[PDB]
Amino acid sequence: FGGTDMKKAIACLLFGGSRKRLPDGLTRRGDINLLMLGDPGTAKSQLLKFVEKCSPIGVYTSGKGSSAAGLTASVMRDPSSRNFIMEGGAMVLADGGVVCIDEFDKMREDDRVAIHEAMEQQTISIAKAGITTTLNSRCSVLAAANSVFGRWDETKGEDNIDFMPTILSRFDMIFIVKDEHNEERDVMLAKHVITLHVSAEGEIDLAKLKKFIAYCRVKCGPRLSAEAAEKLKNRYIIMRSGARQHERDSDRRSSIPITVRQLEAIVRIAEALSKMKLQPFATEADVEEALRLFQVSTLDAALSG
Amino acid sequence: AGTVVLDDVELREAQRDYLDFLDDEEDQGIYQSKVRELISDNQYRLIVNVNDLRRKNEKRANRLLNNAFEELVAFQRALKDFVASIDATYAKQYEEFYVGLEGSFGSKHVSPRTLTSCFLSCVVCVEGIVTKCSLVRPKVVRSVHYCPATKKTIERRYSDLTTLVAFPSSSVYPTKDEENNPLETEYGLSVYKDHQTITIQEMPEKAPAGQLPRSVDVILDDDLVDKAKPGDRVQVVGTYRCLPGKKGGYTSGTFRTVLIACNVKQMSKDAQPSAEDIAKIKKFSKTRSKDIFDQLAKSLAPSIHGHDYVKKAILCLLLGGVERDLENGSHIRGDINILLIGDPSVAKSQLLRYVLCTAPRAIPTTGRGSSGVGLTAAVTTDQETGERRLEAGAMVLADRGVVCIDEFDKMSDMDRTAIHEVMEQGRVTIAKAGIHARLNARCSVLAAANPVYGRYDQYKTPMENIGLQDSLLSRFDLLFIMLDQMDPEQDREISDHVLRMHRYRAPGEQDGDAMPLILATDDPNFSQQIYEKHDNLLHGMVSAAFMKKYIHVAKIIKPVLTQESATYIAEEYSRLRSQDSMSSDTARTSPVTARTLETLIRLATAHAKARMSKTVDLQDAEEAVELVQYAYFKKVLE
Numbered sequence: 001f002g003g004t005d006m007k008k009a010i011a012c013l014l015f016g017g018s019r020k021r022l023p024d025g026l027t028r029r030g031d032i033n034l035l036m037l038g039d040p041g042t043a044k045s046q047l048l049k050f051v052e053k054c055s056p057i058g059v060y061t062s063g064k065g066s067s068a069a070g071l072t073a074s075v076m077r078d079p080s081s082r083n084f085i086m087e088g089g090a091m092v093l094a095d096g097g098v099v100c101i102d103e104f105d106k107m108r109e110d111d112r113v114a115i116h117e118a119m120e121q122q123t124i125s126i127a128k129a130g131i132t133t134t135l136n137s138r139c140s141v142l143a144a145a146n147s148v149f150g151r152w153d154e155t156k157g158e159d160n161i162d163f164m165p166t167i168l169s170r171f172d173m174i175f176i177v178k179d180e181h182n183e184e185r186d187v188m189l190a191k192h193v194i195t196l197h198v199s200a201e202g203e204i205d206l207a208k209l210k211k212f213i214a215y216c217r218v219k220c221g222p223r224l225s226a227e228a229a230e231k232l233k234n235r236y237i238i239m240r241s242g243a244r245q246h247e248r249d250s251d252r253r254s255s256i257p258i259t260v261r262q263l264e265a266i267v268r269i270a271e272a273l274s275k276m277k278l279q280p281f282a283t284e285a286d287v288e289e290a291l292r293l294f295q296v297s298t299l300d301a302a303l304s305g
Numbered sequence: 306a307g308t309v310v311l312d313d314v315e316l317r318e319a320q321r322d323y324l325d326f327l328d329d330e331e332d333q334g335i336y337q338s339k340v341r342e343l344i345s346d347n348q349y350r351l352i353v354n355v356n357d358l359r360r361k362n363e364k365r366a367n368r369l370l371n372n373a374f375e376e377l378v379a380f381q382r383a384l385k386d387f388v389a390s391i392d393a394t395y396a397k398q399y400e401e402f403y404v405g406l407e408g409s410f411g412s413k414h415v416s417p418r419t420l421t422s423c424f425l426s427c428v429v430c431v432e433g434i435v436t437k438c439s440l441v442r443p444k445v446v447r448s449v450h451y452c453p454a455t456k457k458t459i460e461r462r463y464s465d466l467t468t469l470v471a472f473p474s475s476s477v478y479p480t481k482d483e484e485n486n487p488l489e490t491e492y493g494l495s496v497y498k499d500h501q502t503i504t505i506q507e508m509p510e511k512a513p514a515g516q517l518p519r520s521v522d523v524i525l526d527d528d529l530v531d532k533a534k535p536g537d538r539v540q541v542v543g544t545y546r547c548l549p550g551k552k553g554g555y556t557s558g559t560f561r562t563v564l565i566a567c568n569v570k571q572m573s574k575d576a577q578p579s580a581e582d583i584a585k586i587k588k589f590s591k592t593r594s595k596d597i598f599d600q601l602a603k604s605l606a607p608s609i610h611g612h613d614y615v616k617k618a619i620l621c622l623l624l625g626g627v628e629r630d631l632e633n634g635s636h637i638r639g640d641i642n643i644l645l646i647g648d649p650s651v652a653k654s655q656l657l658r659y660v661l662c663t664a665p666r667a668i669p670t671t672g673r674g675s676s677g678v679g680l681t682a683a684v685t686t687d688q689e690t691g692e693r694r695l696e697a698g699a700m701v702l703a704d705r706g707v708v709c710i711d712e713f714d715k716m717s718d719m720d721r722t723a724i725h726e727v728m729e730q731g732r733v734t735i736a737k738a739g740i741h742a743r744l745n746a747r748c749s750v751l752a753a754a755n756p757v758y759g760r761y762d763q764y765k766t767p768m769e770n771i772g773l774q775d776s777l778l779s780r781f782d783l784l785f786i787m788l789d790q791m792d793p794e795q796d797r798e799i800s801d802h803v804l805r806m807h808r809y810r811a812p813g814e815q816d817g818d819a820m821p822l823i824l825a826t827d828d829p830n831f832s833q834q835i836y837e838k839h840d841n842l843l844h845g846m847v848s849a850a851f852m853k854k855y856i857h858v859a860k861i862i863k864p865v866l867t868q869e870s871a872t873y874i875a876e877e878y879s880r881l882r883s884q885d886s887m888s889s890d891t892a893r894t895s896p897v898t899a900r901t902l903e904t905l906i907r908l909a910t911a912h913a914k915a916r917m918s919k920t921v922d923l924q925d926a927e928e929a930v931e932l933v934q935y936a937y938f939k940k941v942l943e
């Protein structure tokens with residue numbers, strides 16, 4: 001039920017932006033990163049499960065890896081055969097895919113390093129006694145979590161999250177899901193759940209949707225039209241100025257910054273929107289929708305304080 | 306005597322075709338020049354491009370790639386004949402000449418996982434990572450013996466039957482004369498060839514994530530023995546064959562397959578660099594000798610806007626200083642260490658990846674991804690000979706190179722302390738009771754750190770914002786605090802640059818398609834204009850390849866400090882140490898020691914090298930002074 005903005009963000013995440021490499025050799029990732037902080041009642045885990053099931057290549061794990069399956073990749077030389085066995089975690093297993101990381105706030109320090117260096121550069125760099133490799137992890141990170149206190153209390157705004165600016169920068173979009181006060185919403189949710197259970201058209205089945213996503217990703221790589229890029233530049237300038245103003249007014253550094261990573265996140269969302277239609281160029285409508293979704297994400301960067 | 310061959314039509318045709326291909330005077334002359342080159346260099350192996358062979362003769366290419374052994378024998382006979390024709394006196398020195406291959410192999414370019422039975426006796430090209438590297442043992446091919454009783458001397462010839470059926474009579478080493486007199490082997494007259502066996506493993510990044518590795522055994526004969534070491538990425542071209550077992554009345558179908566390497570080449574084709582280009586570099590250096598450094602700095606990281614001083618420092622790093630090895634063995638390092646301590650999303654990681662892609666021998670390390678023995682050298686036991694062996698680490702590999710340490714701040718204090726010797730004197734001293742070693746790692750460190758609290762709090766001093774001790778910071782000669790400045794104008798600049806780069810598209814190669822997610826095409830890592838074309842979507846700029854070549858040529862030059870620059874640097878260092886050099890409300894980002902004077906000298910030498918000056922002049926000294934002044938102080942606001 002509900003969560004329409006989150007569902008649109010999930011579709012954008014599934015279709016992804018456009019991976020780019022410039023002449024100098026550098027790379028710009030085309031995979032969106034989504035975070036879903038919210039109360040435990042909501043269906044964040046269910047959304048992650050569906051995303052894993054529907055993605056062409058998708059692995060659903062936890063912050064502390066999984067049972068007998070790690071989160072990132074390690075390499076160990078077998079002393080007898082001397083071969084370097086590469087133990088692959090979720091990130092390397094879902095290369096060119098999606099990693100649905102539930103309980104994102106409960107990771108180890110090594111996992112934190114690996115995710116920091118893999119959410120943006122899409123690579124895991126390992127250097128054991130023998131070799132110095134750089135594994136490839138092209139994966140969109142769909143992370144779930146909960147408030148540090150278990151439930152979000154507005155009285156402690158900007159303190160319900162324990163994540164660092166360095167890790168929140170890596171995220172393209174961040175959503176906050178509350179469940180506080182709506183009797184109408186509660187009755188509708190109960191009706192919908194009881195419906196679902198008893199029942200167990202404009203809806204693309206899972207198989208065709210997965211094939212559609214794969215086809216779009218393989219075929220189309222969009223870009224930005226000049227007018228759309230100019231509009232995005234203006235909106236980004238005003239948004240950064242507003243963030244600066246809010247931070248200076250609150251006299252506290254908001255723990256969810258707006259940065260060039262956010263600019264590129266809007267770019268990637270627009271590219272994904274265009275890719276849905278297979279338009280080799282992104283239009284002002286697509287950039288406006290991307291900005292609207294990033295605004296729904298920004299309803300915690302500025303409004304929360 | 307036995308069954309000799311009188312005439313052989315196929316062998317004669319093959320040798321004639323190969324001799325024709327090698328004789329190039331009516332053609333361009335590439336291979337005649339190559340043979341002359343190997344004659345001059347005193348070698349006995351020629352690298353022949355399979356592409357050229359296929360171009361001049363398709364039939365010979367197919368025959369060579371599908372039945373390699375006899376085809377390579379014919380090719381080597383033709384090579385020896387051609388070398389004799391050019392000069393017989395040199396051709397007489399070496400018993401045989403060898404033909405290694407290179408270029409593009411269509412379906413014969415495989416990984417150890419894809420090297421299956423179908424490629425037996427064919428020529429294959431396998432790219433992989435070395436795991437095992439046995440000792441270089443001499444293998445006797447011609448043994449001389451002396452009989453003290455009869456004063457006779459004998460020669461026994463052993464054929465290289467590595468993959469052919471071998472009978473004991475061939476391998477019988479003689480010890481007694483015909484009448485059982487004792488024979489003494491004369492080692493000084495016998496002939497031995499170096500032999501080695503290595504193992505090539507499927508590259509960890511290219512191998513499937515789920516499954517275990519796959520490896521192939523490689524035999525390297527003379528001239529190819531010490532070309533590779535464990536952990537290296539190499540391309541081995543050779544014949545995939547079957548090894549005979551041992552004499553036995555019973556056998557299973559199983560056979561032990563190996564690869565007799567005909568050539569081995571380093572993956573680091575970028576580790577190595579025409580008269581046109583040399584003259585181009587000369588004119589580029591001569592024409593604008595003052596702003597050349599600034600132009601190179603701006604063109605270094607084109608995809609990243611601003612960060613002028615950071616890019617200048619990165620250029621100084623890539624150039625490196627001039628080491629001073631004194632008459633007493635004392636060592637003063639020449640490498641240059643940069644620590645980008647910065648707010649999130651300020652392109653420090655992108656600068657790291659740029660240096661990775663550009664510099665030769667650049668090793669990417671991460672905070673907790675390379676701990677201790679993985680980051681520096683190590684000592685292990687063979688587990689077969691029960692003897693201790695060294696194992697090179699990240700920095701030992703990066704010797705005469707760069708180590709890009711992402712998230713350096715989040716390295717354990719243990720590792721950060723272990724790296725001190727590498728930073729200062731460029732070596733790792735490691736010892737276990739069995740074995741003690743002093744490995745050389747003259748690497749330059751490029752670290753990307755974020756400050757405590759995540760974002761640099763400009764109200765607090767740089768000492769507090771940098772969660773590192775002064776002893777560690779002194780290791781980094783340049784320390785750059787890269788803030789995410791909140792200026793709307795600079796924000797406009799950055800946003801415009803970012804959106805232009807995101808809008809850019811490849812020229813012609815792409816028209817709206819998606820980038821793809823390798824054996825089909827030749828592997829780029831092993832693959833064989835001063836300014837860029839002024840595209841408006843990229844510029845609104847020295848070429849990458851020319852920048853690479855120019856930096857390579859300018860690295861070797863060794864400018865010498867002149868008395869005027871020495872006096873200037875000394876005076877500036879005295880001032881920097883003095884308290885007056887920093888006003889009120891400005892805090893030192895790193896204490897100023899004699900390490901900073903060495904930083905000044907190294908930066909001035911790097912600038913002089915950028916200009917190919919041959920002398921570090923007052924211009925270079927002033928530039929180094931300005932960069933140090935910018936880097937070593939920060940203005941704290943209230």
Ligand SMILES: Nc1ncnc2c1ncn2[C@@H]1O[C@H](COP(=O)(O)OP(=O)(O)O)[C@@H](O)[C@H]1O
Nearest residue numbers: 001002039040041042043044045046144192193
């Ligand atoms: N909005 C919703 N619509 C329908 N069912 C829901 C909704 N929210 C929660 N549920 C049901 O309640 C369960 C609890 O949600 P869960 O998947 O555990 O999310 P999380 O634990 O990540 O908050 C789900 O399995 C789902 O069946």
Ligand SMILES: Nc1ncnc2c1ncn2[C@@H]1O[C@H](COP(=O)(O)OP(=O)(O)O)[C@@H](O)[C@H]1O
Nearest residue numbers: 120260261608609610649650651652653654655
């Ligand atoms: N000055 C800049 N010029 C160009 N791109 C920038 C700049 N600042 C930030 N970016 C963009 O923001 C992203 C930040 O990613 P990265 O550099 O990996 O992290 P960090 O900047 O924290 O090291 C990059 O993809 C880069 O394109």
Ligand SMILES: [Mg+2]
Nearest residue numbers: 044045102144
């Ligand atoms: Mg959950």
Ligand SMILES: [Mg+2]
Nearest residue numbers: 116117120654
């Ligand atoms: Mg980073």
